[PDB]
Design a protein around this ligand. Structure first.
Ligand SMILES: [Zn+2]
Ligand SMILES: [Zn+2]
Length: 69
């Protein structure tokens, strides 16, 4: 959603949602783990609740540091 060529390459790559094991969709608001990778917003949430690590890059997004409910 692109790249367009211009210009890949860094934060906000997207791919298929991987928590939903399904393509992303123009359905609701979306959100990236500050690792880099984008997901559905609702997914980044329920994922954080279960896996405190990025699903793709596999690592803890950081040690930090919200709470929260
Ligand atoms: Zn999802
Ligand atoms: Zn990641």
């Amino acid at each position: 959603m692109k790249q367009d060529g211009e210009e890949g390459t860094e934060e906000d790559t997207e791919e298929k949602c991987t928590i939903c094991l399904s393509i992303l969709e123009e359905g609701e608001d979306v959100r990236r783990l500050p690792c880099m990778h984008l997901f559905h917003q609702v997914c980044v949430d329920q994922w954080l609740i279960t896996n405190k690590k990025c699903p793709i890059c596999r690592v803890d997004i950081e040690a930090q540091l919200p709470s929260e409910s």
